From a paper:
[name] harbours an actin-binding domain (ABD) at its N terminus and a microtubule-binding domain at its C terminus. The ABD of [name] contains two consecutive CH (calponin homology) domains.
To illuminate the potential mechanisms of how F-actin binding of [name]-CH domains is regulated, we resolved crystal structure of [name]-NT (containing the CH domains and a part of the plakin domain) at 2.6 Å resolution. [name]’s ABD consists of only α-helices connected by short-loop sequences, and adopts a closed conformation with extensive intramolecular contacts between the two tandem CH domains. Previous biochemical and mutagenesis studies have revealed three major F-ABSs (ABS1–3) in the tandem CH domains, which are conserved in [name]. However, in closed conformation of [name]’s ABD, a number of key residues in the ABSs were buried within the protein and were unlikely to be involved in association with F-actin. Interestingly, tyrosine 259 is outside of the conserved ABSs and located at the C-terminal end of the last α-helix in the second CH2 domain. Structural analysis demonstrated that tyrosine 259 forms hydrogen bonds with isoleucine 150 and tyrosine 151 in the hinge region of CH domains.
Residue numbers in the entry: 41 to 306, 321 to 388
Write the structure that this text describes.
Amino acid sequence: DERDRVQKKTFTKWVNKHLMKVRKHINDLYEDLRDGHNLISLLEVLSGIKLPREKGRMRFHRLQNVQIALDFLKQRQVKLVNIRNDDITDGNPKLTLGLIWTIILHFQISDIYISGESGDMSAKEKLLLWTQKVTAGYTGIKCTNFSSCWSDGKMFNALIHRYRPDLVDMERVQIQSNRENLEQAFEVAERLGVTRLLDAEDVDVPSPDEKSVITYVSSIYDAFPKVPEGGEGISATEVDSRWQEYQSRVDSLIPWIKQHTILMSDNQYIHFKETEILAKEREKGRIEELYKLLEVWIEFGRIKLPQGYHPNDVEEEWGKLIIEMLEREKSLRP
C-alpha cells in the first residue's frame, strides 16, 4: 500500500511523459483514466496508430472507450487478467495500476535485446541481465532483483558510469550515503535524457517497489546508445578501444598523405597508384566507415571529436594527393 503510493506516483509520471507529446495530462490516475480518452491517447502515442473513439458523455460511452483500449491490447496478444472496462471507468486503484503496468510492460520494457539472451527469458530477466553485464567490474554483490539491489543507489551510478565515466566518480559513490547516490544518479541521468520517474526518498528503503524500479531502469536503457541485434555497432565496452583505433588510424594515414603529396609537387607512377593508392584509399574507407559507428557516441557526449579528426579532414588531404597525382600524370604521359 506504500508501494502503491509510489507505483501510482511513478506510473502517473510515466503516463504524463507520453501524454505530453499530444498536450494531454493527468493529475489523479484513479480519476483521469475513467472516461477512456487518455488511455486511448496513450496507446496512440505509444503504438503510432490511430484508434477509434466514442463521442458522448454517458457512462456506457466511458465503458466503450475503455473497451476500445482493452481490445486493442488483447488483439496484440497482451494478457489482461481480471481487468474489465468497468474496473477502469469506476476507478479501481489496483486494476488501474495493473493496466498501466501491462501497457508499460508491453510497449517499453518488452522491446529489449541483449546478446547473451535466450528466446525464453522474460523482458524482466533480459533487462536484469543487461544491468549485470553493464555493471560487471564495479564493487558490489550481484544484482538479482529490481528492488533491494537498487536501494543504496550504487547500481544506478554504475549504469551511468559505464556510459559516461566522466560524469560519475565511482570511488566517492562507495562511501556516500544512499540518498546522495540516488539523488546524484537521478540528476545526471536526467541530463542524459532520462525523465525522473523516481524520488530518492522512495527508493532509499529496504524493498523499493519493483515495478517502479524496472520502469525507470528500462527507461535508462532506452536513453543509452545501443547495438541493434546482430547489426554492426559499438557497445559501451568497446568504445574506448575503438576510439583509440580510430585516432591512431588517422594519425597513420593523414601524415602519409602529407609526406607522400610533397613528392608529387616536385612507369613506376603506375605502381605508386594501382598498389599503394588502392591500399591507402582503402584505409581512408576503413576510417570514414568506423567514424560512422562512432557518431552515436559523439552525439551521446562520450567522445569529444577533436579538430582534424573528421573523415573529411582526411578527404581534404586525399584530394590534394589526387591533384598533384594528376599534374605528374600528364607529364609521365608522352
